[PDB]
Enzyme design. Sequence first.
Site, mmCIF file in Angstrom:
data_model
loop_
_atom_site.group_PDB
_atom_site.id
_atom_site.type_symbol
_atom_site.label_atom_id
_atom_site.label_comp_id
_atom_site.label_asym_id
_atom_site.label_seq_id
_atom_site.Cartn_x
_atom_site.Cartn_y
_atom_site.Cartn_z
ATOM 1 N N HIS G 202 0.817 -1.197 0.000
ATOM 2 C CA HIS G 202 0.000 0.000 0.000
ATOM 3 C C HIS G 202 0.856 1.253 0.000
ATOM 4 C CE1 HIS G 202 -4.192 0.761 0.148
ATOM 5 N NE2 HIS G 202 -4.033 1.795 1.001
ATOM 6 N N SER G 206 0.054 -0.273 -6.585
ATOM 7 C CA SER G 206 0.305 -1.268 -7.613
ATOM 8 C C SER G 206 1.235 -0.691 -8.657
ATOM 9 C CB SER G 206 -0.967 -1.708 -8.262
ATOM 10 O OG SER G 206 -1.923 -2.084 -7.274
ATOM 11 N N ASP G 229 -12.875 -7.174 -11.922
ATOM 12 C CA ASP G 229 -12.586 -8.405 -11.201
ATOM 13 C C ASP G 229 -13.714 -9.411 -11.354
ATOM 14 O OD1 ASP G 229 -9.915 -7.791 -10.446
ATOM 15 O OD2 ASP G 229 -10.607 -6.931 -8.476
HETATM 16 C C1 HEM Z 1 -2.729 -16.087 -1.339
HETATM 17 C C2 HEM Z 1 -1.871 -15.708 -2.238
HETATM 18 C C3 HEM Z 1 -1.890 -14.313 -2.686
HETATM 19 C C4 HEM Z 1 -2.909 -13.419 -2.726
HETATM 20 C C5 HEM Z 1 -4.337 -13.583 -2.282
HETATM 21 C C6 HEM Z 1 -2.372 -12.246 -3.313
HETATM 22 C C7 HEM Z 1 -3.181 -11.125 -3.523
HETATM 23 C C8 HEM Z 1 -2.663 -10.014 -4.161
HETATM 24 C C9 HEM Z 1 -3.446 -8.902 -4.514
HETATM 25 C C10 HEM Z 1 -4.911 -8.786 -4.313
HETATM 26 C C11 HEM Z 1 -2.598 -7.979 -5.036
HETATM 27 C C12 HEM Z 1 -2.927 -6.648 -5.613
HETATM 28 C C13 HEM Z 1 -3.692 -6.853 -6.918
HETATM 29 C C14 HEM Z 1 -2.810 -7.493 -7.968
HETATM 30 O O1 HEM Z 1 -1.764 -6.926 -8.364
HETATM 31 O O2 HEM Z 1 -3.090 -8.600 -8.499
HETATM 32 C C15 HEM Z 1 -1.289 -8.503 -5.028
HETATM 33 C C16 HEM Z 1 -0.197 -7.798 -5.462
HETATM 34 C C17 HEM Z 1 1.049 -8.396 -5.381
HETATM 35 N N1 HEM Z 1 1.352 -9.660 -4.990
HETATM 36 FE FE1 HEM Z 1 0.143 -10.978 -4.419
HETATM 37 N N2 HEM Z 1 -1.088 -12.417 -3.601
HETATM 38 C C18 HEM Z 1 -0.731 -13.634 -3.255
HETATM 39 C C19 HEM Z 1 0.441 -14.320 -3.391
HETATM 40 C C20 HEM Z 1 1.532 -13.630 -3.864
HETATM 41 C C21 HEM Z 1 2.770 -14.202 -4.129
HETATM 42 C C22 HEM Z 1 3.103 -15.648 -3.993
HETATM 43 C C23 HEM Z 1 3.604 -13.185 -4.525
HETATM 44 C C24 HEM Z 1 5.030 -13.248 -4.876
HETATM 45 C C25 HEM Z 1 5.773 -14.352 -4.935
HETATM 46 C C26 HEM Z 1 2.873 -11.983 -4.516
HETATM 47 C C27 HEM Z 1 3.475 -10.809 -4.806
HETATM 48 C C28 HEM Z 1 2.683 -9.735 -5.046
HETATM 49 C C29 HEM Z 1 3.292 -8.478 -5.503
HETATM 50 C C30 HEM Z 1 4.756 -8.175 -5.700
HETATM 51 C C31 HEM Z 1 2.273 -7.640 -5.705
HETATM 52 C C32 HEM Z 1 2.406 -6.223 -6.180
HETATM 53 C C33 HEM Z 1 2.301 -6.318 -7.686
HETATM 54 C C34 HEM Z 1 1.892 -5.053 -8.360
HETATM 55 O O3 HEM Z 1 0.769 -4.555 -8.213
HETATM 56 O O4 HEM Z 1 2.716 -4.578 -9.145
HETATM 57 N N3 HEM Z 1 1.640 -12.301 -4.093
HETATM 58 N N4 HEM Z 1 -1.367 -9.762 -4.493
HETATM 59 C C1 LIG Z 2 -12.747 -5.652 3.167
HETATM 60 C C2 LIG Z 2 -11.445 -4.971 3.581
HETATM 61 C C3 LIG Z 2 -10.369 -5.838 4.205
HETATM 62 C C4 LIG Z 2 -9.032 -5.764 3.482
HETATM 63 C C5 LIG Z 2 -8.543 -7.062 2.879
HETATM 64 C C6 LIG Z 2 -9.527 -7.872 2.034
HETATM 65 C C7 LIG Z 2 -9.107 -8.161 0.577
HETATM 66 C C8 LIG Z 2 -9.065 -6.881 -0.237
HETATM 67 O O1 LIG Z 2 -8.391 -5.902 0.031
HETATM 68 O O2 LIG Z 2 -9.895 -6.986 -1.294
HETATM 69 C C9 LIG Z 2 -9.546 -6.273 -2.520
HETATM 70 C C10 LIG Z 2 -10.723 -6.378 -3.456
HETATM 71 C C11 LIG Z 2 -8.250 -6.842 -3.127
HETATM 72 N N1 LIG Z 2 -8.012 -6.430 -4.495
HETATM 73 C C12 LIG Z 2 -6.930 -5.705 -4.783
HETATM 74 O O3 LIG Z 2 -6.118 -5.328 -3.933
HETATM 75 C C13 LIG Z 2 -6.743 -5.303 -6.196
HETATM 76 C C14 LIG Z 2 -5.966 -4.168 -6.372
HETATM 77 C C15 LIG Z 2 -5.724 -3.638 -7.618
HETATM 78 C C16 LIG Z 2 -6.266 -4.235 -8.726
HETATM 79 C C17 LIG Z 2 -7.018 -5.385 -8.587
HETATM 80 N N2 LIG Z 2 -7.513 -6.066 -9.712
HETATM 81 C C18 LIG Z 2 -7.485 -5.603 -10.950
HETATM 82 O O4 LIG Z 2 -8.473 -5.452 -11.629
HETATM 83 C C19 LIG Z 2 -7.273 -5.936 -7.319
HETATM 84 O O5 LIG Z 2 -7.953 -7.109 -7.220
HETATM 85 C C20 LIG Z 2 -8.137 -8.350 -2.973
HETATM 86 O O6 LIG Z 2 -8.712 -9.172 -3.639
HETATM 87 O O7 LIG Z 2 -7.302 -8.642 -1.973
HETATM 88 C C21 LIG Z 2 -7.674 -9.648 -0.989
HETATM 89 C C22 LIG Z 2 -6.551 -10.657 -1.065
HETATM 90 C C23 LIG Z 2 -7.825 -8.991 0.378
HETATM 91 O O8 LIG Z 2 -7.840 -10.060 1.369
HETATM 92 C C24 LIG Z 2 -6.846 -10.108 2.277
HETATM 93 O O9 LIG Z 2 -5.766 -9.611 2.092
HETATM 94 C C25 LIG Z 2 -7.240 -10.865 3.525
HETATM 95 C C26 LIG Z 2 -7.350 -12.377 3.303
HETATM 96 C C27 LIG Z 2 -8.775 -12.836 2.976
HETATM 97 C C28 LIG Z 2 -6.350 -12.875 2.269
#
Ligand code: HEM
Ligand SMILES: CCCCCC[C@H]1C(=O)O[C@H](C)[C@H](NC(=O)c2cccc(NC=O)c2O)C(=O)O[C@@H](C)[C@@H]1OC(=O)CC(C)C
Lengths: 85, 124, 56, 244, 55, 71, 383, 54
Positions: G202, G206, G229
């Site tokens: 944050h 992104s 999404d």
């Molecule tokens: C339960 C597994 C994971 C969840 C739910 C998760 C969820 C997310 C979400 C919601 C974001 C922001 C939206 C997006 O860019 O797609 C994000 C960004 C990111 N995640 Fe994950 N992530 C997970 C696992 C990982 C893993 C395994 C990595 C790296 C090895 C990772 C590295 C990152 C990074 C570096 C960003 C920032 C990317 C950017 O916006 O440029 N995440 N993740």
């Molecule tokens: C309710 C508030 C509590 C805060 C956490 C809850 C979740 C939350 O923040 O939801 C958002 C909708 C989030 N999306 C994004 O960041 C996002 C940002 C930029 C672009 C896109 N996509 C493009 O088009 C995105 O999808 C997302 O899916 O992240 C989950 C993983 C979060 O869950 C948690 O970490 C908690 C737990 C359930 C893993």
Amino acid sequence: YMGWWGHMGSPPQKGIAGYTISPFAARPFAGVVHAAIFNTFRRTKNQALFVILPVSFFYYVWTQASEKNEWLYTKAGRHELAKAL
Amino acid sequence: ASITSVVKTSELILKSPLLSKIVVPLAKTYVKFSGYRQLGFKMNDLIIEETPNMQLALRRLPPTESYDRVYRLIRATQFSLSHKLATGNDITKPEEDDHYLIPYILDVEAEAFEKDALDNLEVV
Amino acid sequence: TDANRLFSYFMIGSFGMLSAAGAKATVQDFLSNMSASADVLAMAKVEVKLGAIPLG
Amino acid sequence: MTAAEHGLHPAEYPWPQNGMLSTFDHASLRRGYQVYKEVCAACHSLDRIAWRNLVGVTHTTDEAKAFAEELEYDDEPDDEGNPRKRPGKLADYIPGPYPNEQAARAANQGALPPDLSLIAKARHGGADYIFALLTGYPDEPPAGVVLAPGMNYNPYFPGGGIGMARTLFDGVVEYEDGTPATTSQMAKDVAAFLTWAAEPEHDERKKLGLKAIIVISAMLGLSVYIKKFKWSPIKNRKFIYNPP
Amino acid sequence: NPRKRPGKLADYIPGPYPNEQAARAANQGALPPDLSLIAKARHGGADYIFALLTG
Amino acid sequence: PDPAIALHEAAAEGPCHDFKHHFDECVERVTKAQEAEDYDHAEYKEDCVEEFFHLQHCINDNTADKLFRVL
Amino acid sequence: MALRKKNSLLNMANSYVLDSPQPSNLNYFWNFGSLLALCLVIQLATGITLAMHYTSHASLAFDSVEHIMRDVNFGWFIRYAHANTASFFFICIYAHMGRNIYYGSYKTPRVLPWSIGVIIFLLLIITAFMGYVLVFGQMSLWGATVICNLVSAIPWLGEDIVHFLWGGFSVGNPTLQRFFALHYLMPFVLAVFALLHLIALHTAGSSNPLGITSNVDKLSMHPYYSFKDLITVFAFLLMFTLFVFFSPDKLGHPDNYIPANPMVTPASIVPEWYLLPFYAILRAIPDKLGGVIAMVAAILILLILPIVDRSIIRGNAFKPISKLLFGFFICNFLLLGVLGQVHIEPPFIVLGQICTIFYFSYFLILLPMVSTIENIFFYIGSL
Amino acid sequence: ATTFYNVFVKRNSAFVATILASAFVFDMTFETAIDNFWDRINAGKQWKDIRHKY
Ligand code: HEM
Ligand SMILES: CCCCCC[C@H]1C(=O)O[C@H](C)[C@H](NC(=O)c2cccc(NC=O)c2O)C(=O)O[C@@H](C)[C@@H]1OC(=O)CC(C)C
Ligand code: HEC
Ligand code: HEM
Ligand SMILES: CCCCCCCCCCCCO[C@@H]1O[C@H](CO)[C@@H](O[C@H]2O[C@H](CO)[C@@H](O)[C@H](O)[C@H]2O)[C@H](O)[C@H]1O
């Protein structure tokens, strides 16, 4: 490095006028047929090599390896298998 | 990497006749294939800015240059999200691709690297 | 025109309708796992003969 | 590995249940149960299936209760705490031919006939493997194969030597529906039956998947309209820059 | 065929009855409880057992 | 009478005739080799499994759909 | 002031899901984050439901899973949904990591979200490995046996550690009960780390596909990314539906429908598909300890990308050579996957070694070389 | 058409009520429709088709 609305951390902006219309005033699917055909063709053609080269190479590698492996475990391949072990 | 490094190495290459003869044509092709000009960017618009040094260099830009950079970034972002390319006047022509930022960042880094050197000085 | 806005809300509302129908289906089917399973429903409702049983 | 060591891979037969919209043929399931009962059940158990599972699939409630009531199962002890047997009920599981593994192996020259309740899911190939195996005993083993004693040659079985002999011959079963009980017919029926045993939800699962596919497709279409609708201000945005 | 073996140290101390029904039949309907937890399963503990057996 | 018996025979004489010949030739060689003495004290004993699989695999490809159509 | 901003609790939701300022140009590869959130929710819902029907005792575990399939209303669905979503979780996680590598999301200022992400990836592997054991089929047992005997390679204490993890001298009931407890717990730890990597992100926000600042042109997370999404949620659910309802066993191994038998060893002990590349890396090293170190290093080496990428430009959108190198890297990672499921035979033994060297040399040699050269080409090429 | 908008869409309470009532109707009719369709494409295969023999 990122702020929030009001102080996002942009260098000061000046001189850009931005215009848009309401979603209710627009055709959301305007020029979709043209884009689906011509735009996708353009974008795919531009990126084709970066997919085709590695995929074709690794497919060829796999094909040669799997065919050799198959041949080694035939009757004809008995001798070559014996040497390979 | 530091912009300083990039600039110094480039100067070594441009000096050597042999090296320049083989590298400069490659680099021109590379830039054509890179395709940042097709989004109306200048090369320097692509340099990573989330660094204290780069933030300082951006603050040192003349107001005009700074306002133009903000426009190019916003324009490019709009082409990106539309999946369109620049056309006509929006395409960056090779003669317009000026290194507007390189002088500023080289000065910022020169000072930062001098500071590091001088922090390690030993009176003899 | 009202026709124009109404159309887009018909799309939004259709999407809300299928999401509501889908959520109901999902919840009802998924939570039914918690109702008596087939072995339990057969462990109950025990059946007994009466031909074997003498008077008194 | 040699193909012998792997086993010949079974052909892809067009089963009635292949096809996103296709259920089992329940008449085949019923015929297959009769093959299981008269041929396989001599050596193989079906431990995960209860009499109640046949009801409304292959048999009416009355037919299934009749099958259960012909058997004796262990009751709770009597009042002197002596063990007792009772007639079977619908909730009872179909009983195995052997009391334990040791009894099973002793009767089968050392080999242990597996339980068939999951065999269709527990082998690559599924119904095709079962069908291929039961129909795939050659009259003569390929010249040069050395079978261990008590082994039978079957190319679909990995290694080639299977402890189970050919069991289906024309007319070992007399089907109650007048279908000619040919080796291939009986193998097709029993393979269908065993597939049902392994996945009894199959019919229900594919109907719910049809409903899911339709709704989720519609919601996908609508979600794309809504996305495009809400994003159109951003996609359509235009700029005019006047350098200051 | 089933078989018996001599007991080993990992074996549990065997009960006098095969099941509850046998137990109750031998005790005019009453079921003698297992004594492994009885000292924790009654208010009083050791004192209750002592009092009961002597009382 | 088992529909498969006739379909397999037809497929062996027809579309899989080349594979039938290979298996046949193989069996001839192996039987002849077994006939010769000091075969039991040989290093490599040839089988016909490979040729058998090629034949069966072929027959199955030409028969599968036809067989299930008559059940 | 609006309640969503005034109230501290609401404000935290607001800052993440509603007013969060996002770049306006994120493409569909930014949607894997929300799909991974959806996978994590489906796994919690289905997982907790299975736990209400599962018995962790080894005498009853396999039978309890059959009970779920056969007796519990919709049990087949909950079981197959849980098993298949574990595959989809890895498709989405590889996609999300791939997106992060291609677009340079690991560079400053986003090293911390990336580094926590590498730990999320390890927890997911552990979580999915333990869940696989709970069935107590043949693949469950033989998987736990071989994988926990890798720990035996740790010098001096290795054997002792294995016996400690198993709770005995072989994989048995104690192992199964403890994997149940931990498999229940680990997804909650994984959710916490997922939340931490977002909180870490944050600060910078992104990245975007151009690799430039987005500070100039932001869009609220809702409604734009909310509705974007949904498209991928429904696309995911279409894929989910095809597997769960129509081919529930396509991604799995039939050997797990045979109850565990310590005597009989299965024909082939191969892991679940998503572990296969790491398995190939392990086989490539002949030494037991070497192999284990290499396998762990294949995951931990991601932590050095922030160092070895020397580019002055973030991401590959504009770097044709880096794009080609990345294409080769990704295809090699898939070939490693395929080599993880072949038999240890020629010619795959040597091939696996070559692919393993290629995998490591990307991080250690090629990426540093290629990124240095491209820096020079951008500068000379734009003079 | 203004009338339709004013009645069913303008107030969100009305719109959500309309959506839920529609969801109820869709759910019920779609169930029935799929049931009939499924029975026609799987004709003579299901238990209900052979049950009459018993
Ligand atoms: C339960 C597994 C994971 C969840 C739910 C998760 C969820 C997310 C979400 C919601 C974001 C922001 C939206 C997006 O860019 O797609 C994000 C960004 C990111 N995640 Fe994950 N992530 C997970 C696992 C990982 C893993 C395994 C990595 C790296 C090895 C990772 C590295 C990152 C990074 C570096 C960003 C920032 C990317 C950017 O916006 O440029 N995440 N993740
Ligand atoms: C309710 C508030 C509590 C805060 C956490 C809850 C979740 C939350 O923040 O939801 C958002 C909708 C989030 N999306 C994004 O960041 C996002 C940002 C930029 C672009 C896109 N996509 C493009 O088009 C995105 O999808 C997302 O899916 O992240 C989950 C993983 C979060 O869950 C948690 O970490 C908690 C737990 C359930 C893993
Ligand atoms: C009198 C013995 C006997 C009869 C009759 C019998 N089987 Fe078997 N079956 C075995 C034995 C023993 C094995 C295990 C063979 C081995 O592992 O070598 C076996 C194995 C199998 C296997 C699994 C092969 C594998 O891949 O492990 C299937 C499937 C099978 N039988 C199904 C049937 C069906 C269907 C029938 C009859 C319709 C049948 N069996 C009749 C004894 C029998
Ligand atoms: C990231 C989250 C999770 C992943 C990746 C995951 C993965 C798995 C996998 C791969 C299996 C083997 C599935 C099979 O082939 O049958 C499984 C089984 C299981 N999981 Fe999970 N799981 C997750 C979360 C949970 C949670 C939160 C619970 C809560 C208890 C849980 C409970 C179970 C149970 C009881 C089983 C065994 C029953 C079975 O095999 O279906 N899981 N899990
Ligand atoms: C946040 C949640 C709030 C509380 C909500 C409480 C919901 C719990 C309700 C469980 C209700 C299940 O009730 C039962 O549902 C199943 C489907 O699941 C229906 O079953 C029907 O469809 C299913 C498939 O969907 C078929 O297997 C079955 O042959 C058919 O009869 C029953 O006709 C109904 O009797």
